Design a protein around this ligand. Sequence first.
Ligand SMILES: [Cu+2]
Ligand SMILES: [Cu+2]
Lengths: 59, 59
Amino acid sequence: NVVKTYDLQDGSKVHVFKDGKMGMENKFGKSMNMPEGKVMETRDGTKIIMKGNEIFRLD
Amino acid sequence: NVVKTYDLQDGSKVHVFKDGKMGMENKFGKSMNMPEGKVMETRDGTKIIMKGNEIFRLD
Ligand SMILES: [Cu+2]
Ligand SMILES: [Cu+2]
């Protein structure tokens, strides 16, 4: 179902689904409200940001 | 002097200069500030967004 998952510094995660949908979870796996316009950083140092339910990655 | 250029669908351009500074030009070549927190569509399809003086690109 998930086509991609971002593994964020803070232990939270963002799943991207086959259907274009997106979902974020805290370090406890509980579902969260995803922040818009806020830079998030992955485990491996990649910076991303969400806007209009799409994901942008630091170029 | 211009290290990177994005050609947008609205006729304007974004420049990233060799120094680090960032600017936009309009259709007429008029230099302006880089719009922050706004998605912009490139002629070649991509969308970008600037936040805190970093460019992020659709993933
Ligand atoms: Cu999960
Ligand atoms: Cu120019």
